[PDB]
Ligand binder design. Structure first.
Ligand SMILES: Cc1cc2nc3c(=O)[nH]c(=O)nc-3n(C[C@H](O)[C@H](O)[C@H](O)COP(=O)(O)OP(=O)(O)OC[C@H]3O[C@@H](n4cnc5c(N)ncnc54)[C@H](O)[C@@H]3O)c2cc1C
Ligand SMILES: [Cl-]
Length: 437
């Protein structure tokens, strides 16, 4: 049974990124991926930190350029108080640092990434499904898998990392997955050909649009292809079944901007983009991201919600953080505890930043007759007590007098909240950036 420095379970952006970064330091890594690449996965809109930070460190800048991925300068939102769409840009000027990102076909993007792993020296093996992580001495020491044929084998390493995404079958070995009560949403999504684009030089921007029952994303993948998804209540899903296509089509009709952008369009009916998928119970965090010899990265560890497109960034950032722990420990410096505690602290900080901001962002949409939006509001009480206090001591307690009248990780249990509080409170990289100094 083969011996490695690291075994990575899953070859999406989390797994391939971590594998590459440790192999780049000259270590033995195996990466097992259940599927044969290329394969469809949701998660198409990217951020500059991944495009200009991660992908540059991986040495993929040039290959990204040549791919023909639409260039994402920011996004447009129909969201909040006003009906008119507003826009954001990553930077004030088009070409200054971290100025843009891409809208990617994940099949091609992940494949591109996994191929780069190989070339970086990673032993990647497709059609290989991990079944169990193996423990000895209270430490993760290997995995059981099935290879390309039905054959059950084993492999061993000093470190085992679950990068196997939301359907991980091994994460419970590290911690308990705890679902957010706030982001209790289901996404229903398909692909459309020949749909319209945003104006100006913004054709490649993501568009997200709120309507009465939730919100839509609208991501251009090429001149002809658009990813389109409705994010609605979990409760609505339990009645979209036996009628996937009809549910989405009816949702499209009920969102003006999406209705108009898809009027010229035909839905893809064949291939990987001809299906309409559902994702449910996607918002969660684990009670722990590492134990002893094992770590969780990407969707295996935690996920917030698709608005503002943070998933691939989180996966790739956590991959870098784990890579640094592994590259620093395999060099006999520091300790496993110091390095993996730093990993979890940093990861929870970035996850927490997005969680907090997205709760407030959901809260800012005004739609007073929407059940969906009314149930996705910041739960205050203490601010309302404060406001009443302040009204009183300003001389304004009389609300009938016209002369005078002219929290944290919401939706989570205490355990997640406390872990997040410690990490956020409400080490520096080596010159290489591949380990800790
Ligand atoms: C509705 C929806 C919309 C989203 N939109 C965006 C977006 O616009 N932008 C963005 O950045 N993110 C988006 N995300 C999130 C994004 O999908 C994920 O965050 C991202 O794919 C995480 O990558 P990963 O490497 O951790 O996992 P994955 O991409 O899921 O890859 C894990 C890999 O592990 C493999 N695997 C599974 N089990 C095993 C096993 N037993 N053994 C071996 N291999 C296994 C799988 O085949 C897969 O290839 C969205 C998510 C949802 C739910
Ligand atoms: Cl996301």
């Amino acid at each position: 049974p083969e011996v490695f420095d690291l075994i990575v379970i899953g070859g999406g952006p989390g797994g391939s990124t971590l594998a590459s970064f440790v192999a780049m330091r000259g270590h033995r890594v195996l990466l097992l991926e259940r599927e044969a690449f290329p394969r469809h996965q949701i998660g198409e809109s990217l951020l500059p930190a991944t495009v200009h930070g991660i992908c540059a460190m991986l040495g993929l800048t040039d290959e990204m350029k040549r791919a023909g991925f639409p260039i994402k300068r920011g996004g447009t939102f129909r969201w909040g108080k006003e009906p008119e769409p507003w826009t954001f840009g990553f930077t004030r000027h088009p070409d200054d640092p971290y100025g843009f990102a891409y809208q990617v076909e994940r099949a091609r993007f992940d494949d591109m990434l996994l191929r780069n792993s190989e070339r970086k020296g990673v032993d990647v093996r497709e059609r290989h499904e991990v079944i169990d992580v193996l423990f000895e001495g209270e430490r993760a020491v290997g995995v059981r898998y099935r290879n390309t044929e039905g054959v059950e084998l084993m492999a061993h390493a000093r470190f085992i990392v679950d990068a196997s995404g939301n359907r991980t079958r091994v994460s419970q070995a590290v911690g308990e997955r705890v679902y957010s009560r706030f982001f209790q949403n289901v996404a229903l999504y398909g692909y459309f050909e020949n749909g319209k684009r945003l104006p100006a030089p913004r054709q490649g921007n993501i568009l997200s649009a709120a309507f009465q029952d939730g919100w839509f994303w609208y991501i251009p993948l090429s001149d002809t292809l658009t990813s389109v998804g409705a994010v609605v209540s979990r409760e609505a899903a339990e009645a979209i079944k036996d009628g996937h296509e009809a549910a989405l089509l009816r949702y499209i009709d009920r969102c003006p901007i999406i209705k108009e952008y898809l009027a010229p369009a035909t839905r893809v009916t064949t291939g990987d983009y001809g299906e309409i998928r559902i994702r449910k119970d996607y918002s969660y965090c684990n009670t722990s991201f590492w134990k002893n010899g094992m770590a969780l990265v990407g969707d295996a560890a935690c996920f917030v919600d698709p608005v503002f497109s943070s998933g691939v960034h989180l996966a790739t950032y956590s991959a870098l953080l784990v890579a640094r722990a592994i590259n620093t420990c395999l060099a006999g410096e520091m300790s496993e505890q110091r390095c993996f505690e730093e990993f979890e602290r940093r990861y929870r900080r970035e996850y927490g930043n997005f969680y907090q901001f997205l709760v407030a962002f959901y809260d800012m949409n005004q739609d007073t007759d929407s059940y969906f939006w009314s149930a996705r509001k910041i739960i205050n009480t203490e601010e309302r007590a404060n406001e009443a206090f302040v009204r009183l001591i300003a001389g304004r307690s009389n609300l009938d007098e016209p002369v005078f009248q002219s929290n944290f990780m919401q939706g989570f249990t205490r355990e997640i909240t406390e872990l997040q509080h410690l990490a956020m409170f409400g080490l520096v990289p080596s010159r290489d950036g591949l380990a800790w100094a």
